[PDB]
Amino acid sequence: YCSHMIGSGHLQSLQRLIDSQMETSCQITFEFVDQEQLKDPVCYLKKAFLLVQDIMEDTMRFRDNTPNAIAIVQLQELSLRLKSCFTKDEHDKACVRTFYETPLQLLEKVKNVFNETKNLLDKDWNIFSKNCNNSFAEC
Amino acid sequence: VSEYCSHMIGSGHLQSLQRLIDSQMETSCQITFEFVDQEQLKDPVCYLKKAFLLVQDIMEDTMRFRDNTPNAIAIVQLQELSLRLKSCFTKDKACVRTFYETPLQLLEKVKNVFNETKNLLDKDWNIFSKNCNNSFAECS
């Protein structure tokens, strides 16, 4: 069931959202995974996915009843069900750093999480049952 | 100037701007851009004249969207509009200041220049043939 939970539709509402944002110098603050501390690809997605949930709630806010706003709602609802595909190991700031980048650099991070997560669930529905207490400990 | 400017700016433009604004993510960030200072330039007409010019720099340089997106074309259209509006403004970095405000605050300023410009042209399409040399000179 986890396999095809993330549909192409979610990816396209993300892309549209990414394509709608203005290209400026603007830089914002947000917590996200540190690639240099967390090398393991699978564990990276496990943690990123959780930090994304906060990012969609706290940072990614759009005027109510707009395509992008509703797009975010969808993703959040989807995520609540995706959680069951991820066995808990979290919400502890291990392997985490503060970022200062553009909203576009951010949204790209979020898009890649959903993308890679989708590709890997379609292929190995059981992939995220892996124990990442080891990787999380070595950060 | 002619009656060619009486209804140059239609609601379609203002409504594409609001849509362009509503689609942006609400952020705390602040960006840099050069705009008019209401204090240095007190004259409402001459204020809109210069703001209109600066908006041209802002559309091209600051308000950039990915090619082939509804917003990029909305900007292209607003630039096609401005090209035509130039026949309504008679030729004359004075009265200019650098603003450090959020992107949405900027887009709101742009909207107000087309919004307040639209209202006056409908009433007096020959309004921007005004000589604003004297007002631009008294700016510090």
UniProtKB/Swiss-Prot annotation, chain A:
Positions bearing carbohydrate: N115, N133
UniProt superkingdom: Eukaryota
Disulphide-bonded residues: C2-C85, C43-C132, C95-C139
Protein name: Macrophage colony-stimulating factor 1 43 kDa subunit
Organism: Homo sapiens (Human)
Gene giving rise to this polypeptide: CSF1
Residues of the full protein shown: 38 to 178 of 554
UniProtKB/Swiss-Prot annotation, chain B:
Glycosylated residues, chain numbering: N115, N133
Disulphide-bridged cysteine pairs: C5-C88, C46-C132, C95-C139
Highest rank taxon of the organism: Eukaryota
Full protein name: Macrophage colony-stimulating factor 1 43 kDa subunit
Organism: Homo sapiens (Human)
Section of the entire sequence shown: 35 to 179 of 554
